[PDB]
Amino acid sequence: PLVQLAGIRKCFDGKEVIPQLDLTINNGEFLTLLGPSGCGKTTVLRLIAGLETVDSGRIMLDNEDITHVPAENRYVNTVFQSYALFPHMTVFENVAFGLRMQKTPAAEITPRVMEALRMVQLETFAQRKPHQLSGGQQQRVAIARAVVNKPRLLLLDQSLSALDYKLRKQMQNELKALQRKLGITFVFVTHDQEEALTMSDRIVVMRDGRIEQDGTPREIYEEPKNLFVAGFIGEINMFNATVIERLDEQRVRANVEGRECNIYVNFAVEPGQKLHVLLRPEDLRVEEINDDNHAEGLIGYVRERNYKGMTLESVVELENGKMVMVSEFFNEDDPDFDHSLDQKMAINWVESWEVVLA
Amino acid sequence: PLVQLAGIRKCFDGKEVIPQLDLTINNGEFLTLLGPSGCGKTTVLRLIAGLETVDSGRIMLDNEDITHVPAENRYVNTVFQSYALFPHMTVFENVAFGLRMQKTPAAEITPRVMEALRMVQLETFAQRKPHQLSGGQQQRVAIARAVVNKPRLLLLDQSLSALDYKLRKQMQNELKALQRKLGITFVFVTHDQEEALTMSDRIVVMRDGRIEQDGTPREIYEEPKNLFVAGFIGEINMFNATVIERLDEQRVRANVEGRECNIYVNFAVEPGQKLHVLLRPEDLRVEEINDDNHAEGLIGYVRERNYKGMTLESVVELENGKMVMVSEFFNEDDPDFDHSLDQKMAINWVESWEVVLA
Amino acid sequence: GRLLRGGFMTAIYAYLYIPIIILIVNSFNSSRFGINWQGFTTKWYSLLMNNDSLLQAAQHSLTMAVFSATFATLIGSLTAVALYRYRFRGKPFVSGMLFVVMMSPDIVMAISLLVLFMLLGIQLGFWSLLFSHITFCLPFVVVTVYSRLKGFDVRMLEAAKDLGASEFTILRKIILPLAMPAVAAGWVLSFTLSMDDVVVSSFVTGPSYEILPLKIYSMVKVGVSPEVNALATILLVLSLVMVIASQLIAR
Amino acid sequence: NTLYFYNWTEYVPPGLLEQFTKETGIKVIYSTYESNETMYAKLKTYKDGAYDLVVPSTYYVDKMRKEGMIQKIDKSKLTNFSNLDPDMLNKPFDPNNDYSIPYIWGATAIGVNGDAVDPKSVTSWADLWKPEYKGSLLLTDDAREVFQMALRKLGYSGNTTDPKEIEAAYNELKKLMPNVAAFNSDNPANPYMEGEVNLGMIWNGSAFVARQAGTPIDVVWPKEGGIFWMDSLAIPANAKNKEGALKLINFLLRPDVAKQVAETIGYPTPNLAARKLLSPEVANDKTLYPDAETIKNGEWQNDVGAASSIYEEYYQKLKAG
Amino acid sequence: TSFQNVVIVTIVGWLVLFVFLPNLMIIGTSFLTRDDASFVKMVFTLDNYTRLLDPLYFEVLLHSLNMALIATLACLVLGYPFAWFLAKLPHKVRPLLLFLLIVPFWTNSLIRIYGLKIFLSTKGYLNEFLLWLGVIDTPIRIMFTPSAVIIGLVYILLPFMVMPLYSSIEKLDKPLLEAARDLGASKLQTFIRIIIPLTMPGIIAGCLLVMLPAMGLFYVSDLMGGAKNLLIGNVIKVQFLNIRDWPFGAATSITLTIVMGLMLL
Ligand SMILES: Nc1ncnc2c1ncn2[C@@H]1O[C@H](COP(=O)(O)OP(=O)(O)OP(=O)(O)O)[C@@H](O)[C@H]1O
Ligand SMILES: Nc1ncnc2c1ncn2[C@@H]1O[C@H](COP(=O)(O)OP(=O)(O)OP(=O)(O)O)[C@@H](O)[C@H]1O
Ligand SMILES: [Mg+2]
Ligand SMILES: [Mg+2]
């Protein structure tokens, strides 16, 4: 347990941002923080570092009380969101500031700085001022300045937002390799959810200072725990169900959008409750229904398409008046009626694929 | 043709940044600009606005020459990247600056500002200084400041980067609604490619000041024209092929990675040529082969699997020594089959689904 | 448009420089009340090089100005940084004493400080003059540096602390270059204040540390000879060559 | 040893002091002061600092004997005391030259620019009160000189020490304000060389120096009288080296030294054995060196106790009309 | 924390030693009595304050304040455009011109005033020039008038307004100005709504440093405009060096400082 936060509480001008917070960070861990755009994520990172202090609680690092130790005495480093960059120095001095202040011998200042500059693909911009560069270049300079040292705890706050996709993949791999070879612990703040899910091994979701769900990047997607952590991670369509009869110890009959069907429930249930059934866009199948008679399948009408890349988002309205958000893969060269508009449509789902909640 | 750029050339400190350019922006259009982080997009946006006059060339807005007409006289508005936000004014004054500077009647200032703030979900933050806000709230204020004047041309420079997914979708929908209702032209520069394809009508890809390809959101992703536009818009596998003999036209026999197969080529080809065959990761089929005999397919071994949400990236290495990419839905979880590890399997496509380049 | 701007700037420069040319020219006239030209002569310069009691006044005044300005700018810069950033019990008391110094009628100071030095035993001369030339010239540098410091960007300070920065190094490297013009203005203002003083120094000095402005003011009885114009031309030439050397050599 | 000299900046010429050092091993360290009041205050407050020879005025040679700040001058070993005009020797501010020795003298009188105003049109103090001279008079900025002008116009003595007489002087001076154009704060010849003022108070030596620069400024002796002044040499009563000071006085009483001093600065000299050696036209110029009866039956600015405060308060009130 | 402690201790100690102790003596003297041959005696009186009720002192205070405010405004009006224009020139030239502005000010003030009086007098060079070329038939008289006092005060106290203003102007943030110009602004409205609120500290600093010293300059005014009007400096100087009533001078100085401080609120 490298870092422990117990009972940390913080208020700004009399209003609460973090009421209660218990958190543990270990060694060799990649931890990502996600949230609804304004709950609190930079406040936590600044509290962990030597910036603004805590009203009440305890911060422990390596089983040592550090709650009243300032900056310049903690072995942590940070990458800011506003690119806190010294405007009167070249790139080289910006990168070498951290090395110089720890009395690094003058022999290896240049090779290490040039190594970091090669890592971020900016070896040719060594002697250029910050106001002669652009957004991605400034951000890469900030990353390089933070990673030149060998800190045991690196806090990154939106460090890969101003780069293009192909370069973002290279930086993800670079950071992953550095973590694997050395042993740095990372606290990564982002809003791109796919990068969070690919790249990390614990993901913590927040809402107004409350920890809503903490788990490995697979339970965040496969098994949501509240209704908020289910409608935030991706696209999802919620169905209302009424339990009818308890069939088996893992099978329950329920009337859902007016059709009786079989679902998997793994907790106590009694005929008379209102349950939420959660399905994903890519788990539903659609089939044409030319015949007037309809059996074993929801009826709807397809309204528009989106074509968001490799996937063709499709909206189908039921007679009840609700969207369904059906998704698939776009096969243009396939001529077997990939797309057709304004027709009656049927939608079904494979059993034991849904998620059940109270 | 609302804006016409003819022969624009600009050099910074003696080095070429925009060599030569010819561009046309029409009415009621969504134009998105994509490039590799240093290409020169924001200089183009500044050249359109009154800032940063041209070294040589010519610009028309309708039929009148603005190439030397200063700012304060052009009817365009901009959303900056650095959030150029006044620190001595409230959010309210920041929003109403533009309204007041064109001598609006004093009665309509308050309702228009409050409508603009209700659009961006910041009604309660009306009387707070900028330095008390977060990054996302500052960016939302930046959008609201430019929107509230109702201009004919609106330029956005990474205006949806600091938000989460659900709010970003809402802002995309809101901007599209404004464009449909009023008739504004949008020049929007961004790095999120899925958002670029889902919400645009023309897409311009650039490199080192060159307009490499201009076309509809489908021509970029389905039929690239250059090798750079093929390696920048998404994930792709490229194979080398040599033509053997030409069958009936729209069908050509070629040897690719040691297998003779058919490729659909629609131009003149002579034997002995070397061609590039590009395939998308989702257009490959991977099939298990327990029998020792292999026929009609390239043979290789899977090396790792990646869990990217809703998909399952997989990389396979052939006996040749090359790694190629394959993708499929992973929420096919809870199956019977469909999980495996390092084995021997074959890769096969579906025919006439490839892209062929010289 | 450009023409009017140039006209304004050259008008102010003319207003400030056209009497200096008149002094330089009258340094060569034969009349001892230069209002007209009465011939070309170099008698005044030959008289000055031989006076051997005004040259020492110039040297003493230059040394006083240099040392007083350097220490005043250092102490004032530290005071301004302390008021802006550091947190201690009473700032209003510190601020008020600067205001009182800036409002002293310049006659009461020369008596209060004189009585104080005799009480304390400090010998009158070099040291007494320095300790009075530093005390004033302090509010000017404090006010200038505090005006420049306001509106500072705290992101740089936070990043420097994050990377590890003791108060000395962050002060020096981050604040000193970003607030350098205020420091230079303070230095030149302190220099120009420590050369026109005639009231405080006449009291707080001793039998042998005579300075130049005292001599000029006391010459009013017998008239001010063109000797002082000859001295002023030499000092102006030195000041000009010093900076045309400094700019050309390095920057 | 060494000698400390407290004097005006250029009152004793440089280079002239070099021969004193060549003849005698004494070297002089020279300290200068702005005005007599500063000299009084600095000398009274700083007792630790000791000076060796100081040059007061006619007022301040008095006021410094009664309060011990001045010392007796032993005239036995000043061998050149004969070379001095007896008219300036004995005066009511130093009874027998026991505490001072005259060094430089002068007078104050009406100065007229002959180019613009006829010199013979004005002949007395009272003619400055005529209504035609509106906005064209220059007056000296010190209370005692202006109040002496008024008192001599009325017919009283300069040191009246009677409040009733000062009241009449104040009332008379109140009528002169519409005529005043400036109160002079620097050398009297300076405002005349620029043409600002063509008639008013002036010192005779300044008029001589101004005429020697091409401006014809004549000086006319008022019938009521001329206001006299002189400077003197004295010892500050706390001196480490008294013999050096009393030798310096002897050196300054020589004929050739006096002639050089009177040549380098135009102000008259009290040596009678030295004005003969001067130029024929300089010694005979009647305004610079007036005739004997005017000098001996003259007014000198002696000390009046407790009434100087009245003069200064009235000078304050009169300006802020 | 040691460095901060040392800095604070040094700053407090210097100020207490060289400002507090003399002022305590001043206050103690202000409540005492005049005596010859000692300059002060041991009698407690309040008359040194109740003698300030005559109209003379209030009138001279008002006149001094009027001249100081006029000089301050004139320096502001003549100096703000100078700093703004100079802030636009290339970066290499700026320090050279800054120093060339101040090098005239490194000479004794009295000699400078002598030069100006030679320049502007009736028989000065300006009139002779404007006469030999035609125009100005009779000489233009400008000396010994209240306007000459203002000319001299500006001639002495110009940099004290320029340098604090240039320091504030140099640090202005470019993106804010670009955003304003892009939102449809104009030069006048940009000046009113942005530059002045962001440059006000420089204006306040310059105004203080030109106004407060201006009350002590009573010698340049005396030379350039006669002595036809009194100022507070002459009153205190005569109270100290000519009447030799030191307690009354102390009382006048303390009342002046209190009034000036309260006026600034
Ligand atoms: N100086 C401040 N004073 C008062 N309230 C503040 C201040 N800073 C932040 N707040 C409030 O704290 C809350 C959240 O703080 P914070 O900026 O850390 O959120 P965040 O999620 O990390 O940022 P983002 O929205 O970019 O994801 C916001 O409501 C914000 O308005
Ligand atoms: N002030 C400048 N002086 C000299 N060169 C500059 C300057 N600003 C930018 N450049 C150069 O312009 C090029 C990039 O131009 P531009 O800023 O228009 O695109 P960009 O900001 O990099 O796009 P993106 O924000 O997506 O990264 C860089 O090579 C950069 O070094
Ligand atoms: Mg943030
Ligand atoms: Mg950009």
Residue numbers in the entry:
A (entry chain A), B (entry chain D): 16 to 373
C (entry chain C): 3 to 253
D (entry chain E): 27 to 347
E (entry chain B): 5 to 269
From the paper:
The PotD-PotABC protein complex in Escherichia coli, belonging to the adenosine triphosphate–binding cassette transporter family, is a spermidine-preferential uptake system. In general, ATP binding, hydrolysis, and phosphate release trigger conformational changes in the transporter, leading to the uptake of extracellular polyamines. Here, we report structural details of the polyamine uptake system PotD-PotABC in various states.
The K223 residue in the scoop loop forms extensive contacts with the residues W34, Y37, N213, W229, W255, and Y293 in PotD that participate in Spd binding in the pretranslocation state. We also observed a large cavity (with a volume of around 200 Å3) formed inside the PotBC. However, we could not observe any Spd molecules bound inside this cavity.
